[PDB]
Symmetry: C6
Subunit: 80 residues, 6 copies
């Protein structure tokens, strides 16, 4: 049959790459992925955080963050 | 015929499904893989959304992960 | 003492029957239950989805859905 | 006397309790059984709700399951 | 190194004491803690519930409640 | 150098971090301990909040527990 791509294997392939993470509650990040665990907690470097003010606006740059996997909506490998 | 939810998803592997997330985001896409949390990997994705003006396509995406913590409902072949 | 009815045993008794599921976020379904797991993920056939537009309005019919147990608010055996 | 939350619920089996869910739904009902997730089965249920016009009874229900993912607070004999 | 204070050890130290619990969704309680588990479910006695009507208003007194750990935002040992 | 999220937090023990919770509460504080759920104990805390008038300090607190179910993001030395 097809190739099966498990979720945690997809994320694993993302390490070293700039990814885009959409978090619940209208906050979005672009960052390079350094690690993750089974809960889909992630460590991003070189981050840009985007929000939505009155469309998509950058609201911050940061060196390093942790994003909580309990708060992730969607991840986009390749980063946009 | 008792159908386990995971066995329903498993049958959809390589097919298009329709996924209604929490927060009125909806995604049509080809299911590539999944886990017991209903974390899913979708390809060939159209993102729908809701705009004051019905349901509008607001995006096209390739390989994503949708967080199972954030899924509401899944329509096999929707 | 009384009869104890465990939650997963209640759902088990629902198999084959039309149930009513209230999901978080003002979406409601009536469907025949075909399976479920320990997370309260469910497979419904013959479904009517109701929402709330400006009271309770039917918004869709579907053949088969999966409802995520992480998003369930309440289940009503017998279906209304 | 340390009281484990589950041992508090266990004592309520066969009695009326008051359950405040997430999202301003509230339920008075007779507790029939439960699990460690605070999934609960309630009988003889009155559903309260909030309406612009206080707390209004918006429904009467028989045997339900209330999802523990969605519970905020539980009042023994409320 | 420093003293490490694990979350469940902090709560353990609170038993017998009046604590303040902020729950998600703008509801707050002050109560004496009688028990808790690994999910951060808690049993409070002698409770005051505060809400926010049009600032912080007391909305109820209760003898005993259970607060669901899935709905806790923050706990404050010492109680304000 | 693969960095596990828990190993990132572990390095912050005894240092100030910045924690963005769900619901637009934000907390600067000294990390005292944590668990795999990202439950955390913070000291010497300033609570920020959002007020129609930017980001306003709305409180000062001592030893709290922040619920990991309710964390969005964590900035080491923010």
């Amino acid at each position: 049959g097809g190739n099966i791509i498990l979720p945690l294997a997809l994320i694993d392939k993302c390490i070293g790459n700039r990814i885009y993470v959409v978090m619940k509650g209208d906050k979005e990040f672009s960052g390079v992925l350094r690690g993750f665990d089974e809960y889909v907690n992630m460590v991003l470097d070189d981050v840009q955080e985007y929000g939505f003010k009155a469309k998509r606006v950058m609201v911050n740059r940061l060196e390093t963050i942790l994003l909580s996997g309990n708060n992730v909506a969607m991840l986009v490998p390749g980063g946009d």
